[PDB]
Amino acid sequence: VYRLAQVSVNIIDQCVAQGVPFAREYGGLLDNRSFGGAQVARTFYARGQTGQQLLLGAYQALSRQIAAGTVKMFPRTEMLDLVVVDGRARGIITRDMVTGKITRYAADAVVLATGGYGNVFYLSTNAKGCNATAIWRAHRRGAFFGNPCFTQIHPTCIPVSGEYQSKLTLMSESLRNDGRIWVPKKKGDTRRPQDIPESERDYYLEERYPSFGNLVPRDIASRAAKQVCDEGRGVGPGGLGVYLDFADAIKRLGRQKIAERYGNLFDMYKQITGEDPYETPMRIYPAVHYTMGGLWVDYNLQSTIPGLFVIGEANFSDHGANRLGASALMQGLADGYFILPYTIANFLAQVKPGGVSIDRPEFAEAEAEINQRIQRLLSIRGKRTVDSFHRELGKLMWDKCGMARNAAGLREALQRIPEIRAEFWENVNVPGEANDLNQALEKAGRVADFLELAELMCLDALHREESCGGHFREEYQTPDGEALRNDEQFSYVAAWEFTGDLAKPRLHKEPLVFEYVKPT
Amino acid sequence: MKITLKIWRQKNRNTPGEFKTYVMDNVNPDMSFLEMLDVLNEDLMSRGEEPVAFDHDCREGICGMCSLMINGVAHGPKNAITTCQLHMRSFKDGDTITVEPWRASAFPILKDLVVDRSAFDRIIQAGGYISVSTGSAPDANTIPVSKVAADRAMDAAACIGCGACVAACPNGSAMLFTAAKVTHLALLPQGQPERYQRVVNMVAQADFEGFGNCTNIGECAAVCPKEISLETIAQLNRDLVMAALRGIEPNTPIVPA
Amino acid sequence: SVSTGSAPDANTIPVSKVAADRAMDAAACIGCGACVAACPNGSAMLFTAAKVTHLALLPQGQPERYQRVVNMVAQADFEGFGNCTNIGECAAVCPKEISLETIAQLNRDLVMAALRGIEPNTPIVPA
Amino acid sequence: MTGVLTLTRTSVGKKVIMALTGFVLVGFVVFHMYGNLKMYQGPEVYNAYAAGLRELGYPIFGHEHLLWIARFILLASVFLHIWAATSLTLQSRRSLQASSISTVRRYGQHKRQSGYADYTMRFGGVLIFFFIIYHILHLTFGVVGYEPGQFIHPHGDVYETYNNVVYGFQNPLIVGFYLLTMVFLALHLYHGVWSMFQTLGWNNRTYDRLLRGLAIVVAAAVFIGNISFPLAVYFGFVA
Amino acid sequence: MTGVLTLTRTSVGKKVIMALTGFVLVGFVVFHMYGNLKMYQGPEVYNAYAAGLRELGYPIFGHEHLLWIARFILLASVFLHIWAATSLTLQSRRSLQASSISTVRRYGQHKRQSGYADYTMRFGGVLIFFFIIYHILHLTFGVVGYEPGQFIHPHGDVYETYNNVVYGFQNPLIVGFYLLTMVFLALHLYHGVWSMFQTLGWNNRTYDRLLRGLAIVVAAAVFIGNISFPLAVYFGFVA
Ligand code: HEM
Ligand code: HEM
Ligand code: HEM
Ligand code: HEM
Ligand SMILES: CCCCCCCCCCCCO[C@@H]1O[C@H](CO)[C@@H](O[C@H]2O[C@H](CO)[C@@H](O)[C@H](O)[C@H]2O)[C@H](O)[C@H]1O
Ligand code: SF4
Ligand code: SF4
Ligand code: F3S
Ligand code: F3S
Ligand code: FES
């Protein structure tokens, strides 16, 4: 964490040099803003697309290196397995997504920068293709999964209009600083939300939780929202949503200044839902957003497999049980620019270059396994689609391993996950062929990995008999609803080893000692 | 809503394509266009037909993956949005919607609606960057960028690389994409040391990749999701004229890998 | 428009000794208003042009100079000052001998800002 | 490394060449319409204008020297214009041949929101090229479109340009050809006067509407004058 | 957001407009004095100059076309000049009105060190405006200051400008009005030739004295020629 905070300054220098159009003041110098809950203005931003401009700078540097010939770029290529030779990550097995060709690549070191597994819950703020295939294959090859159950949610997300939808668009939580969360008191109401009288509105988070008034943390408020929607009282096309109303703030403050504060958000909400939030209440619903778990890495950003380096969201690393705002972009750019160049050189200087080709038996075994898996997926020809199984898995994981977790629910999920996996492998429909642009095949592979990863996530959540950050156990909480830690028994990182049994992975504790920031 | 869909179906690059008709009995007005395509794909899979393949990652209008020519317009009838940001409330009951890929020589079709847009990557590789290595950057406040120049460069830099400018251009030209990158890097001081080279290289690459020329028509700006203006193209033109006055010669083109 | 804490190293941007000397010549304005009193039109052109020249001769004043002159000129109109007939009675009485080259510099800045279509902001209303 | 001649290397540079040669050609077309407006002034005024075109700056410049310099400039400008137009049209056709429904359809539907300037510019350019060839052969040389004994070539300093104009627009087919070319030249000017400013980079938000208005004014003036000429000659107003 | 037309928004921009229109008007005044110097060559040369002002570029431009373009430019320049002068005079009057000894006196004492350019410039501008009106009615139109049977209007290409001038400066009152206007126009030029350079920013320490000398030269030349004309006509030197 100190290393990340210490290299953040170099990150900002590099991004400004690369041409990232950060916000400037009128005098020409950089402009800072503050997130929600932060006491300093330490955030550098493009107007509303900071991540786009950061990735555009990084992608322009990558394009410069592609032109220089030092980097070979393989887009539309999905890594389907990790090849470990003599205990080292010596290659990968990939499938071209257009021609369907399986290719073997050999390297002296393998870096996994494959993002988070937040899509193990079907409904999430992540992109449609975001998956856990790379880190799960590395985990099955010998990498330890560090705190898989550590998942972050976003409070303010645009809900779904039906069972078809799988993506919840993220809305700046700041929409929670100026709105009131409510639900009609009648379980089934046909009236328009603006026509509902004040006395007939259930303003939960205000009637309950008098403390943290209008400033409830995202976890408590989102658990309350999920409970309300599960009780049948939520609003929206499927009942999964709550009314974040802005009527009283519009009446109180100036509509012009409210526009200056949330114009892009309101226009986007009206584009997505078709309802103007200046008159009608906005509808929101919590969604899984980030996964600060991932493959355990050491100070050198190296996993349990020597030569395998995991960076970005794919590793556990240094977000703890809750990732701060504007810290995942910081961590990714830090790992890429100012940490991995050193630690990977440290690893490579102690080994000889080359010596492993793609003709090794390990490459052939991994390729045969991948081919057999793809053929089996294409040959099942069941009566259920891939997204049906993914939706069932995500529903179970969001109900059982989501913002509210308990022992009985996690045990039920641990019973059901293998059943869903067996039903998938016996009754999934993957049309098409292997050597074609088969998007159903890619989805099938990702969901096949998700079905195994979810069991580990639930086992880790049942393991941790405490609440910390995003991981919330209902049996370990303060009377206010906040997370209650057990630093005497759970002050460690749980790195899980794949033992060949999906239900019985091996737990390896990495003790945590705090010499500079004492727990409190 | 009852929606009739005339969707381009092509097996691969070599196979000739055609229009196939699909009737959606029930379409939710709140349902997005890509969500409706997903429902159609699920129906096709249940029936045993080949699902329609289209590019999509973010479904937020920022990644640039979605690329559909809907009813003759890139990204659908509604402007300043993407295909993913287009929802079925923009259509009516009984409507017929024609769904197409991008049509351009430099944007080959790989599947029903999927298009190979790597020519944009090779345009970027031909100078669409600032040649600064990691570790050599000075303090982030060493060089002042005026708020106006920063805002204009952020206006140009907000380009999701969808290729809809190429698709809507009558000439199939990548002028808006190239001009947006040229304007983004030319409005900042950090892009001054290599700007007159960059535009030339980039323009030459757009010629090498197979894109057309600019007749100053403006359909590219009409369909741009990010409302990138034709002022970017005027800026690129100014840069290219200035580079010609300086005798700047394009480098070797970025050949594909 | 530079905020506290964001300034770079003081030797980052070189200011030539001639430009620094000219900007110090303009910056030496004590805001007495004697230019307004000597001006037959009651104009604040020497004071405004001194400030415009001081900030426009330094690199740090480049990012907002063409706006600034316009705004400042508009404010001098809004405050009730007269126009400049290039009489020069402003510079005759100036305690700090602010030259009429400052007004020529302001004029160049305003012409350049007009060519760029710089619209004056809303005026500073009194408190 | 070859200087300004690097413009030929890029399509944008060829377009800049088109913009400069179109500046020249637009200026000539406006000046030509203004000069030919002297038909309504009368035969004596029109023939004096025709003769004084050749005798331009006589006490200093020789006979037809300025006119031959202007002719060479026009020829070079129009040749560069046509060459660059051919190259750019071929490039834009190759840019659409690979991925299109046919050789005549790119999309099953392509609704246009910003004009059909490509179609009008290219077809009107080919028409204008043909018209320039035929019109040179018609009025400058009188080797086509004339009954025998109707066209009077210049005899020293005596010019019968008015007689040639009067006897030229008698066949309704020639009048229709001229009117069609003037329609397509009006479309050419209407797009190209704005587009040549946009091509050189001399455009922005605030002057875009002004340049569109200038394009409309130039196109309308040239169209009105250049269609008034043969219509008035054919209808007997000019005789 | 408006473009160059944002100059109307500021007093400094209005002064820049007045500097440009004063460039135009100073050029016209110098050229007009130079042309009117031809009256000493004789009636033939003066009338030829008057006629050739209309036939400027006859083999190319029609009659009075260049003259009418020059007239429109002069009218637009003088209208913008007068509008900006009125706006700025009103602004300075408002600037002085609130704090002053009276409506006329500003200070119980104001010892001037850099001349009286405001007084002379404003009073001379009003006088020059009145003179332009009376002068257009006098010599261009001959509807004032003439006995019945002395002004000859140009019907064809034959001009009697020399006769009109000779018959014009016969009344001593008209000669005195012209002389007073020339004195105030000399003061106007003496300040404004330097001032238009100072207003556009084209001034510094090194060229200030050179521009003051240029202003003196222009003012002296125009004054000497423009007072020589009516004095010589009145005294019989020109007849
Ligand atoms: C009467 C003489 C002509 C005039 C005044 C004229 C005027 C113009 C102008 C001003 C432009 C705009 C240039 C730019 O966009 O930068 C233009 C474009 C064009 N002209 Fe011409 N033109 C003339 C003759 C021709 C001829 C003979 C052709 C024959 C092909 C032609 C074909 C074109 C084409 C194709 C374009 C647009 C190029 C493109 O598609 O990118 N023109 N013209
Ligand atoms: C109906 C309208 C027009 C009329 C009445 C007209 C009339 C004439 C006449 C009588 C000539 C012979 C004089 C000579 O060759 O010197 C001529 C020449 C010419 N015209 Fe036109 N013209 C018209 C339209 C155009 C247009 C639209 C163009 C556009 C390029 C054009 C270009 C030329 C050229 C290049 C010449 C040859 C000039 C020369 O040889 O010196 N004309 N025109
Ligand atoms: C031949 C006619 C005229 C010429 C050549 C002429 C020339 C000039 C010039 C060159 C200036 C200096 C502009 C500047 O300082 O930037 C000026 C200033 C001025 N002129 Fe004129 N002018 C003429 C007619 C008039 C008329 C008709 C009026 C009023 C009705 C007028 C009123 C003024 C005023 C008030 C100023 C100075 C205002 C100020 O500096 O604040 N002038 N003149
Ligand atoms: C005593 C000196 C002057 C003499 C002898 C003189 C002579 C003449 C004559 C004879 C005309 C009629 C010719 C014509 O209208 O084309 C005329 C017109 C004119 N004069 Fe003067 N003038 C004198 C001073 C001035 C001055 C100081 C101005 C300053 C603005 C001026 C502006 C004009 C204008 C605008 C016209 C009308 C031009 C036209 O209609 O084409 N004159 N002058
Ligand atoms: C009336 C006489 C004039 C008109 C008749 C002659 C027309 C000739 C043009 C026909 C096409 C050949 O035109 C030729 O196009 C090619 C590629 O298209 C251009 O080729 C050049 O630019 C293109 C991109 O712009 C790239 O391939 C490359 O940089 C270079 O080869 C040539 O610069 C041009 O000469
Ligand atoms: S310029 Fe606009 S339309 Fe073209 S690729 Fe970029 S975002 Fe898409
Ligand atoms: S007289 Fe000189 S010092 Fe006093 S306010 Fe005016 S410019 Fe400043
Ligand atoms: S529509 Fe095409 S011609 Fe240029 S201005 Fe846009 S790329
Ligand atoms: S005296 Fe007055 S007119 Fe201008 S130059 Fe000085 S403020
Ligand atoms: S899917 Fe990313 S822009 Fe539409």
Using DSSP, state whether A96 is helix, strand or coil.
strand
- E-strand ranges in chain B read 3-9, 18-24, 69-70, 73-74, 96-100
CA distances from E188 to C38, D57, E127, E146, E215 (A): 22, 38, 11, 29, 10
Residues 6 or more apart whose CB falls under 8 angstroms from that of A105 comprise: A91, A92, A94, A358
Query: Are the C-beta atoms of residues D121 and D86 closer than 8 Å to each other?
Result: no
Query: Are the C-beta atoms of residues E173 and E202 closer than 8 Å to each other?
Result: no
In the chain, the amino acid numbered B50 is E
B234/D201 CB distance under 8 A: yes
- D-interface mutation test, from E60, E61, E68, most D Cβ less than 10 A away: E60
Using DSSP, state whether D54 is helix, strand or coil.
helix
In the chain, the amino acid numbered A29 is L
Residues of A (2-31) whose Cβ lies below 8 Å from C: 25-30
CA distances from A242 to A50, A221, A264, E47 (A): 29, 11, 21, 93
- B-interface mutation test, from D6, D12, D87, most B Cβ less than 10 A away: D12
* Longest alpha-carbon distance in chain E: 66
Resolution, angstroms, 1 dp: 2.6
Query: Are the C-beta atoms of residues A339 and A308 closer than 8 Å to each other?
Result: no
Where helices occur in D98-168 by DSSP H, the ranges are: 117-135, 161-168
Among candidates A291, A313, A332, which has minimal Cα distance to A54? Answer: A332
Q: Which strand (E) or helix (H) includes residue A20?
A: none
Residue with tokens 């990702």: A446
Q: Using a 6 Å cutoff on CB, does residue E159 contact ligand 4?
A: no
C6 closest CB neighbour out of B141, B145, B147: B141
β-bridge partners, B87: B32
Residue C45 alpha carbon, nearest atom of ligand 9:
7
Among candidates A122, C103, A293, D92, which has minimal Cα distance to B173? Answer: D92
Q: What distance in Å separates the CA atoms of residue A386 and residue A420, rounded to the nearest whole number?
A: 12
Cα B217 to averaged position of ligand 5 atoms, centre (Å): 22
Residues 6 or more apart whose CB falls under 8 angstroms from that of A318 comprise: A1, A3, A4, A331
Give the pairing type, strands B96-100 and B3-9.
Answer: parallel
How many other CB atoms sit within 10 Å of the CB of residue C17?
Answer: 8
Q: What distance in Å separates the CA atoms of residue A130 and residue A118, rounded to the nearest whole number?
A: 8
Cα D3 to averaged position of ligand 5 atoms, centre (Å): 18
Q: Going by CA atoms, what residue is nearest to atom 6 of ligand 7?
A: C35
Q: List CB contacts (< 8 A) between E204 and chain C.
A: 101, 104
E239 touching chain D per CB within 8 A: no
Q: Which strand (E) or helix (H) includes residue A252?
A: helix A247-252
Half-sphere exposure of C124 (CA within 13 A, CB side): 10
Residues 6 or more apart whose CB falls under 8 angstroms from that of A339 comprise: A3, A7, A301, A311
* Closest chain B residue to D205, measured at CA: B231
Examine the residue annotation and report whether A218 is marked as an active-site residue of this protein.
Answer: yes
Where helices occur in C1-127 by DSSP H, the ranges are: 17-27, 34-38, 45-56, 65-78, 89-93, 101-115
Which pairs count as long-range contacts for A183-188, CB under 8 Å and 24+ apart, including other chains? A183/A228, A183/A233, A183/A234, A183/A235, A183/A242, A183/A243, A184/A233, A184/A235, A184/A243, A187/A232, A187/A233
B141 closest CB neighbour out of C8, C59, C64: C8
Residues of C (35-74) whose Cβ lies below 8 Å from E: 38, 40-43, 45, 70, 73-74
A26 closest CB neighbour out of C7, C8, C64: C64
Residues of A (116-175) whose Cβ lies below 8 Å from B: 127-129, 161-162, 164-165, 167, 169
How many other CB atoms sit within 10 Å of the CB of residue E227?
Answer: 18
Residues 6 or more apart whose CB falls under 8 angstroms from that of D71 comprise: none
Ligand nearest to the CA of E198: 3
Query: Are the C-beta atoms of residues D88 and E95 closer than 8 Å to each other?
Result: no
Q: List CB contacts (< 8 A) between B170 and chain D.
A: 92, 112, 118-119
Query: Are the C-beta atoms of residues A114 and A385 closer than 8 Å to each other?
Result: no
End-to-end Cα, chain D, rounded Å: 58
D53/E62 CB distance under 8 A: no
Query: Are the C-beta atoms of residues A201 and A185 closer than 8 Å to each other?
Result: yes
Written as six digits, the tokens of D127 are 């028409």
Q: Which strand (E) or helix (H) includes residue E90?
A: helix E65-97
Cα E197 to averaged position of ligand 9 atoms, centre (Å): 15
Q: What distance in Å separates the CA atoms of residue D96 and residue D104, rounded to the nearest whole number?
A: 10
Q: What distance in Å separates the CA atoms of residue E64 and residue E54, rounded to the nearest whole number?
A: 5
Using DSSP, state whether B215 is helix, strand or coil.
coil
Written as six digits, the tokens of C96 are 């700090």
Q: What distance in Å separates the CA atoms of residue D168 and residue C107, rounded to the nearest whole number?
A: 58
β-bridge partners, A24: A30
Experimental method: cryo-EM
Q: What distance in Å separates the CA atoms of residue C60 and residue D239, rounded to the nearest whole number?
A: 72
β-bridge partners, B238: none
Written as six digits, the tokens of E36 are 């009117």
Q: What distance in Å separates the CA atoms of residue A23 and residue B145, rounded to the nearest whole number?
A: 9
